[PDB]
Design a protein around this ligand. Sequence first.
Ligand SMILES: Nc1c(C(=O)NCc2ccc(C(=O)N[C@@H](CCC3CCCCC3)C(=O)NCc3ccncc3)cc2)cnn1-c1ccccc1
Length: 338
Amino acid sequence: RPTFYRQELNKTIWEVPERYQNLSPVGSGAYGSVCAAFDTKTGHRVAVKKLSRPFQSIIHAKRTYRELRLLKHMKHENVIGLLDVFTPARSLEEFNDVYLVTHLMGADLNNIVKCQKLTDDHVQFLIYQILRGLKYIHSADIIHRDLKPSNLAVNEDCELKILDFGLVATRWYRAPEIMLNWMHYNQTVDIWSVGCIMAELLTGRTLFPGTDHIDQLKLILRLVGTPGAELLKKISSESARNYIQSLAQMPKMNFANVFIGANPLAVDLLEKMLVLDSDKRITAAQALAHAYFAQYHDPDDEPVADPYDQSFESRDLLIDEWKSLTYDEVISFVPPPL
Ligand SMILES: Nc1c(C(=O)NCc2ccc(C(=O)N[C@@H](CCC3CCCCC3)C(=O)NCc3ccncc3)cc2)cnn1-c1ccccc1
């Protein structure tokens, strides 16, 4: 058990092993309570996240457990990974704080798109990496559900990782089938988000900047057109079905006339991602084989994930139970090799 030291960073206490030096807060809140730090074991910059009030309620406790289970699972070049997880607590009794250590990324894609206009080469490589990360996440029956430019981070080498900073509107990147509340949705909600992201990388503009869930739905249908009988037949919600069918019909736009001057291959992939019918939307694994990625695509180098035990998601437990389970996960953690 290493030696810890204490300090106070922007109205927050931090008790970290001495191996982590020069803690410097980052993102002024956008990422949570996160410090850049120098890791003396590796000689690399890292990010250290202190969980806020991790065991305040059953719901915080379950969220804390979930985040640690997800981070301990992710072992892929295009998904954030756990370098370390620690607590200053010597016992389960004293256990009240959780610190997660990850790679420090250079910039989020929101800052990249807002600051820079991207080339087709850079779009190919960034979307290839998102899809490669998604293939991996999806193979474990994990759905991100929150994909947006601020949840993607890039290094100066253009190496991309998928993250989720939690709480640029999520709304703008969200699949129409999980816009009005209901349970008919698959992993391809994430492929819709990737389409919205790729559009914004290609054009410099939010594709669908809805002011609310109704506006958002109107902006989507204006590009992809109102559903035919085929898709209408699969909408269980009378109230959603009444809303959609209450709209004046709208044709599917020719995407080549919307994304004028884009690589036609980019336009073809976008057509395959921004399909209203989530049963007909391209999967991550399918998208990686698209002729848009010919330069990057290597079927022997697009790994899937080990299975992930999500069975806790259905469980209703007490704070102290979720806390004990989280403590177990802290103790059993095996760092990745240096
Ligand atoms: N700010 C940072 C860091 C940093 O902050 N690292 C710590 C960290 C800890 C956890 C997570 C995280 O993603 N936790 C994910 C789980 C893993 C996911 C699972 C799905 C697939 C993706 C991975 C998570 O549960 N969130 C909490 C949450 C999500 C949704 N609703 C509510 C709460 C991300 C980062 C590193 N680099 N940078 C950086 C620096 C400069 C510019 C841009 C970025």
